[PDB]
Design a protein around this ligand. Structure first.
Ligand SMILES: OC[C@H]1O[C@@H](O)[C@H](O)[C@@H](O)[C@@H]1O
Ligand SMILES: OC[C@H]1O[C@@H](O)[C@H](O)[C@@H](O)[C@@H]1O
Ligand SMILES: [Ca+2]
Ligand SMILES: [Ca+2]
Lengths: 742, 739
């Protein structure tokens, strides 16, 4: 069995060969046809390479793996990793957009399909999911995550891990997952990427940690450290974090820890010392694999000779890496993931694209729909206008490194396809992405270019207005470019670019009904748009099928059913503003802004523009009164909470029913509410269904001042609705059972 | 009969109810002169239910109220009389944030001395001051009451403030008991919204936020006020770790009493902590001694005692602490110590006091830009003064000036005309209201701090000012905030000059005439566009009753501006929180290299603030030589002497604030890129050179490490000296421990 086989392996290994297993270097370019004489080859031959990443194609990966199998002393195969974030070649929506589906079945599926494509191409390990909680729309990496809520985040994290890893690591359709970035990366100060993070231990445990824990408990194979410091120690060298929290219950994690890109080396910049010092710190902390920086490879032996680390520390890190490869099936078949036929037939198939088209349409959030503007009639003339109206490579959004960007369906493309002979579609650019070309340049890196019009904005705006005047309705494709979010894409301004707002205004001024189809990787400040635009559909970035999926929604093929996973502020002045907040000692009563001497601003209401969980539909949903099985409970009983949901509008549709719980009094202050459950239900027009939730004390537990995980006896409010804001509710009392106090 | 014996003897005579009554600091209700003894508050005092009262004004009223306790209560225990004396009593000095920019501890202390003198002369023996909350968030209206973002400068000002109020003896009739607030961390409210949640690590508290409070305590501050915010999920007012284990940690004993903020106990109910009895008991157990307004102590402590939820010892200890403050202030030898009509007649708002305020105000201004020798203005030709803040008295003292003679302040128009005389013609024009949106103007001008409002269309009023401006040789635009746009519960999600005023400024610039922006504000503002387009910018904060004269002294060059920012001025609110003493991060952006993908930086704004901590210009120029160090290799408890030649290389006499920064390069935890560790304000005649010297020891190197241990670690440091936290001369050293 595994344990005997790996001890046997390690018994044959030299110190340098163990150290080598901990190395995850950059590959450098590898000339197809002479991989065995390439730069990386020599290091593989000497047993200095544990794995590689962002190598693409089974053909290339196969020949690189051959070097390790045929030309290294012990023939230890490599891991091959990659950033498979929201799909391999078929792009699903960016993670933040996927979160708004609130559909854990759909989400697990997208991961499943992504792992089927990657594994068919020699990839056996993905750097996903990223489950960083964040309350800061300025941070470009909000797009990679799933919002501000620990519960929803935890559910999604589970779905993602289950999707990738499947039923068994050794399946050639399952890949190993890597939860990132441990930890607290989403609280970087001032929303500036990589910036200082600081918070209390109790906040960590209640507000930020749960998603990481769900990934571990779901059996995630690996964990990736984060770039930020915590309590003044970078995550990568933080022993409390990587050892005391991550591996507390011994048998709990069991996987291995990889650093983020040169995160060890960067501890030098942080102010922790030289490369040897920070490398040793990382190993003692519980880090097992060193990404790109080679601090482990170059300094571990010296540190050992110097007594700064121990043999057992090296052996334990090496063991974990081998155990990963063993689980993935690599020792019984180093080429398990290398089949030319799978790669030809199981990637970017018509079936896969179709599923992505279906999923994408379920992620859209309908933020406004006045006067039945949507769905559009498929008749007359429709004017599509804006810098995002006819572009392919931006549709998949950021973190789509293996995506077929150029085969993506543009919005103009999908609209003409949908309209057919029944409606005429007119196009106009309207305006560039921004007035500042240098901003455009840096916002469109990595080949994600937008066609640029050199003419004066007024000329181009007038052009679009003339076209629009010839149409009956106007569809405005505005927002961000794909690379305005993602890594190192922080924005101090979270509005739609000014130039585009000037365009939008000129369109509204035509008197034509306007639909704002919004492309973004983050929450945006949209008060003015909400005030003036008849309809607003948030499409995030929908993937390779964006144009088709969006057209499904626009014409009413699919009834929008998405709901916000993060709060949209009125202005960046409100940040951070989130749903699960404390009451403060001077709360502003609802509807009373402005009140002197309450907690509020002089110049903006306390409320965000759209709250967590917000999402409209083409139809309407009516909630009956909240039914509770009991208002007086004791010990480990089960509370049943039920409610009637009725489709009272004009169309078939789905709605997300949300359960919130409030702990009224506590030994510490409790959030005014916390998401604790949800169910997505489809209803025929006029149909009524009884939705039921089962609450137990487990749902009432929190981390107290002493970090004890428990619930306290007292009153609670149980809330249910399609919003963190609009809810039916009922108070209950829950007591302890003296007999069972252990 | 020393204090301890007397207090013990007294408490032996008191009923439980009388001990509890000493813990009560209620709101007074209206009190009709000539019938105080039959007024609303009178019955409570007679029953012994009142330990103190606050915000009552005038020695006449206070003597009479004190007479109720002295003559009509069973034990004749006199009352404390407190007030918010924040930046002056009737004579108003600049707001504290403004004052902090003087970087002149003597002036800070003197301003507090004059305040104590005035307040004590009018019956006040206790001020709710200094406010020493560290803040990195300019949205927070209360930044105006503090001293900026730096623990060191903050700690220095705290000492200066406490000494100024308290003197060397609590029993002097010119000294009043100070009260450090708001313990603690109040300045980190989320999203800059007053009273909002606070959260942070212990190590950040100790290094970045706690030092000013500790300084006040070590300076001997007589009392401490709790804060409205929670910490680790527990409101400060009910937080035993904070109020006992930190505040009264054995060594460094705080010996004074703790008073809650305004109904802070009752608000713990809203926080989510329980009912009034529960939260009251929590507060007493935490170490709270006096209960402001909410009467939780008064109405619930006995019941808790009966139920064994609190102890007699806890009540006794609190009562004793209150009685000790009264004793120290001399109230048991003379209950009317602070009640002398003649003092109040001769020692308040005197011509001398007003002169001192004028001098101190002028030294608090920060010159943020001065291109092409626009300032100082020549006292000739014609000068146009335009803006919503050009001719208004009541706003000049700014916020937190409840006792100030607002209506007697010197408006900028007034002060200018006076200094001009027959040498220069001052023209005036309104230009614009404070803001479009009247309803915002209204909530921003509460408490009787009203501005003249012009019903005419904005374009009309602008054309009026432009036509006046076009007749002058220079325009002086008085723009910015109103007084109550900052202060308590005055948070702004937008920290620019109000748009209407900027549209006015644009119009004034377009005349082609040189424009000087005289900026009124209680907070750092985002001023990028203004910095790019306005020739000269003078930040005058809120200068107090003498605003007009002090500002004219600067404009004409009577006084050469010498202030330095104590808080960072961001490029936009999207950069917040942005501060000088920050960590390096693992991916720092090299200086001058914005923008770099995969470095710690924004797509749409540079990393740099607009004006950094310690920034401030002069009418003259200062040149620093090279930094001279006595040694670059130190061992144990040696003294390092750092010296530098400073030269007044400009055209005017003037002072500059020489600043000392230190960087600990490597730590067991990450260390800030720099921390202020010393400063000196020095005056230099035109062309004069002086050797400025600092003396550094390991105490200057210490910090709280991961385990909260206060100590220094051996290794390399950078020593930096300059007039600014960004423009520095530096030299690296090695400091080792010894066996
Ligand atoms: O590409 C490997 C890693 O690069 C890092 O810069 C990112 O922060 C990670 O999310 C990514 O997985
Ligand atoms: O007026 C008494 C107290 O009122 C409170 O609302 C403020 O926060 C304190 O600074 C002030 O001293
Ligand atoms: Ca409870
Ligand atoms: Ca050091």
């Amino acid at each position: 069995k595994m344990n005997q086989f790996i001890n046997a392996l390690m018994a044959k290994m030299t110190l340098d060969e163990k150290i080598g297993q901990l190395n995850l270097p950059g590959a450098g370019d590898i000339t197809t046809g002479q991989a065995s004489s390439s730069g990386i080859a020599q290091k593989i031959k000497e047993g200095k390479v544990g794995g590689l990443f962002n190598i693409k194609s089974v053909t290339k990966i196969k020949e690189v793996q051959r070097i390790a199998v045929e030309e290294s002393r012990l023939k230890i195969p490599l891991l091959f990793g990659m950033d498979v974030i929201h799909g391999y070649e078929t792009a699903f929506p960016i993670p933040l957009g996927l979160s708004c589906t609130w559909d854990m079945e759909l989400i697990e599926k997208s991961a499943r399909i992504a792992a089927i494509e990657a594994s068919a191409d020699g990839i056996c390990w993905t750097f996903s999911p990223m489950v960083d909680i964040s309350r800061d729309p300025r941070w470009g990496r909000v797009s990679e995550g799933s919002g501000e809520d620990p519960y929803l985040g935890a559910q999604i994290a589970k779905a993602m891990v289950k999707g990738y890893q499947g039923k068994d690591f050794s399946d050639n359709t399952s890949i190993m997952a890597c939860v990132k970035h441990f930890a607290l990366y989403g609280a970087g100060e001032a929303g500036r990427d990589y910036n200082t993070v600081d918070m209390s231990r109790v906040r960590m445990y209640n507000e930020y940690f749960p998603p990481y824990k769900a990934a571990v408990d779901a059996g995630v194979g690996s964990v990736m450290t984060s770039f930020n410091e915590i309590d003044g120690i970078p995550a990568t060298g933080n022993k409390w974090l990587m050892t005391d929290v991550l591996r507390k219950r011994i048998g709990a994690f069991k996987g291995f820890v990889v650093t983020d890109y040169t995160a060890i080396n960067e501890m030098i910049d942080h102010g922790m010392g030289d490369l040897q010092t920070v490398s040793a710190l990382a190993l003692r902390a519980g880090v097992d694999m060193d990404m790109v920086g080679e601090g482990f490879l170059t300094t571990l032996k010296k540190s050992l000779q110097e007594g700064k680390i121990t043999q057992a520390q090296i052996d334990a890190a090496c063991k974990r890496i081998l155990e990963a490869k063993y689980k993935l099936g690599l020792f019984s078949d180093p080429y398990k993931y290398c089949n030319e036929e799978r790669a030809r037939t199981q990637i970017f198939t018509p079936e896969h694209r179709k599923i992505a088209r279906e999923i994408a349409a379920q992620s859209f959030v309908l933020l406004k729909n006045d006067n039945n503007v949507l769905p559009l009639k498929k008749s007359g003339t429709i004017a599509l206008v804006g810098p995002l109206a006819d572009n392919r490579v931006n549709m998949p959004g950021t973190w789509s490194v293996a995506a077929k960007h150029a085969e993506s369906v543009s919005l103009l493309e999908g609209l003409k396809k949908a309209a057919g002979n029944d409606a005429r579609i007119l196009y106009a650019h309207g305006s560039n992405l921004d007035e500042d070309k240098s901003l455009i340049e840096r916002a469109t890196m990595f080949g994600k270019t937008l066609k640029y019009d050199p003419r004066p904005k007024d000329v181009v705006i007038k052009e679009a207005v003339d076209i629009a005047n010839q149409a009956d309705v106007i569809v405005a494709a505005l927002g961000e470019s794909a690379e305005m979010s993602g890594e190192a894409s922080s924005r101090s301004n979270i509005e739609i670019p000014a130039l585009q707002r000037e365009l939008l205004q000129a369109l509204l001024k035509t008197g034509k009904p306007v639909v704002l189809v919004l492309f973004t990787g983050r929450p945006l400040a949209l008060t003015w748009e909400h005030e003036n635009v008849p309809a607003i559909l948030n499409v995030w970035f929908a993937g390779t099928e964006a144009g088709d999926a969006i057209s499904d929604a626009l014409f009413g093929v699919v009834n929008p059913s998405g709901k916000l996973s993060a709060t949209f502020p009125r202005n960046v002045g409100q940040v951070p503003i989130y749903y699960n907040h404390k009451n403060t000692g001077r709360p502003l009563p609802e509807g009373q802004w402005f009140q002197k001497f309450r907690s509020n601003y002089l110049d903006v209401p306390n409320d965000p523009l759209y709250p967590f969980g917000y999402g409209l539909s083409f139809t309407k949903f009516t909630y009956g009164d909240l039914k509770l099985s009991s208002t007086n409970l004791k010990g480990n009983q089960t509370l049943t909470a039920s409610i009637e949901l009725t489709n009272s509008g004009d169309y078939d549709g789905a709605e997300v029913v949300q359960l919130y719980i409030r702990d009224l009094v506590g030994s510490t202050t409790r959030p005014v509410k916390e998401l604790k459950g949800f169910q997505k239900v489809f209803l025929k027009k006029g149909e009524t269904k009884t939705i039921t939730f089962k609450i137990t004390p487990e749902d009432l537990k929190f981390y107290n001042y002493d970090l004890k995980y428990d619930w306290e006896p007292g009153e609670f409010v149980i809330m249910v609705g399609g919003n963190s804001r609009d809810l039916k509710s009922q108070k209950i009392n829950w007591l302890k059972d003296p007999a069972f106090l252990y």
